[PDB]
Amino acid sequence: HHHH
């Protein structure tokens, strides 16, 4: 789920 983590994004920049």
């Epitope: 789920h1 983590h2 994004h3 920049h4």
Partner: single-chain antibody
Amino acid sequence: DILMTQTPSSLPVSLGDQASISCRSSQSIVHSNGNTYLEWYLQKPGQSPKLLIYKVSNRFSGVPDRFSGSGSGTDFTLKISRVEAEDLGVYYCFQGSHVPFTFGSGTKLEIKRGGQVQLQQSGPEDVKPGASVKISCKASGYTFTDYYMNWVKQSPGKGLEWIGDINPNNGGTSYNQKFKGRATLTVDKSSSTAYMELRSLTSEDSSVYYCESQSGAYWGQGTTVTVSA
């Protein structure tokens, strides 16, 4: 792991002309929240990469609409109408939708011939193989803990590589497995400084290391780590 394929690698152009760069992902980079974290960067020789386009088509504050991003799913395009001397350099696409984030191989936009927030990185390091190194990134001009801090490696070997990131506020981390836990990201709130520790260094770790925050909007000048016996 998503592979970003950039085309073409070399793009000769005359001033005033229109350049068009393509980028393709090995698989969809549509994030589950609905966004598509596709970014375009421009790097001039001797400098750090600079953000041009994010989320496929948003222009970073300050970038002229001569630069235009488009695309969808796995197909993306960057178009520069009426190229200027300032546009010359190497362009990179990047996906920040799925960990580990990855960059394209790059496109060299060169001329046809004929006829205040800032990130300060620590000094260069020269170490012996098997040794360990620790570089810093002092932040200022913004709230250090409101944004994730990213670390990027750059070597002629494989261009740009995302190492991992850290939430300065709570210590939450995200790492690129390719580094096999040899990298440790830490932080110091009191001084708004981020740190990166890399151990068991080999010649392959010799590169320029960058810290970048606010989703690639700000970069450090980079730190050169040379590993020689």
